[PDB]
Chain A
Amino acid sequence: RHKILHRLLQE
């Protein structure tokens, strides 16, 4: 799932 990683990626 990787929630932090996804949020840092889309920004």
Chain B
Amino acid sequence: ESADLRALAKHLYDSYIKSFPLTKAKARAILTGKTTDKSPFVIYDMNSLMMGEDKIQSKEVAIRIFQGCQFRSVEAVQEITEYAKSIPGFVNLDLNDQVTLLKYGVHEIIYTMLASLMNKDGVLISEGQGFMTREFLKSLRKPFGDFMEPKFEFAVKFNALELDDSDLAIFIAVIILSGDRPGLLNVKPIEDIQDNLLQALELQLKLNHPESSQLFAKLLQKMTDLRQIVTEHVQLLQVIKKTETDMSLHPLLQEIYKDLY
């Protein structure tokens, strides 16, 4: 029934609130001027970056930023793994399939949720403590200065769909249970969970956005634009890995990127 699908939707929503401390609702409070705690410290050039590091050496700026992204990617994988484990039926899957789904899903989810922390002018960092302008990220020396630009461009169009947290929670579940990841051993029970999640998603969108026609369809088209961000991103990272003194890639991220599309 509709009701079983409502109940799945709510269950994913609560576990998303538990798993992810900075929700899209809070990011949007922060960014709009609403909320009544302090405005984020903004980082727009080298000097502001430096002063931001005492409010929020040895190495070059583009590399400091790179390595900061790694720290937050690592924690994001962790949060996403915990959310995955609350998706009904996920932990009954072959463990090797759980790993494959995370390995390919995590980046797609990361860039979906990054869009929550973004506007056309920059991005929240350190959990809403800071705001790092897009210009400044764009201004970094090659190849570092175009690392983020494709995330921003995706974010601006994705953000126009005006999804909320309750929507996003089912969307990210759907992405995680994609039956076409390379090397999956047993596709069937993954497509059966995903079938149920997609039905949950479609109900959710009709209920939550009754005025937004074909939002389900528009949102399916995004699950495959994400694919492109991911492949471009892996390509640019293979380049950095080749051309930069100390790759220094966190070993969680090395597990994820090894033998990846």
List residues of chain A with CB under 8 Å of any chain B CB: 2-6, 8-11
Residues in chain A near residue B91, CB distance under 8 A? 9
A9 touches B252 (CB 8 A): no
B95 touches A10 (CB 8 A): yes
Interface 9-mer from B98-106, B112-120, B215-223: B98-106
A2 touches B99 (CB 8 A): yes
Min C-beta distance of B96 to chain A, whole Å: 9
Known: A8-B78, A10-B95. A2 touches B85 (CB 8 A): no
A-B contact count (CB 8 A): 28
Residues in chain A near residue B211, CB distance under 8 A? none
Residues in chain A near residue B255, CB distance under 8 A? 2-5
Q: Once bound together, how far apart are the Cα atoms of A11 and B218, in whole Å?
A: 36
Number of B interface residues in the complex (CB < 8 A):
14
Residues in chain B near residue A5, CB distance under 8 A? 81, 99, 102-103, 252, 255-256
Q: Once bound together, how far apart are the Cα atoms of A5 and B85, in whole Å?
A: 12
Min C-beta distance of A4 to chain B, whole Å: 5
Min C-beta distance of A1 to chain B, whole Å: 8
Residues in chain A near residue B99, CB distance under 8 A? 2, 5-6, 9
B81 touches A8 (CB 8 A): yes
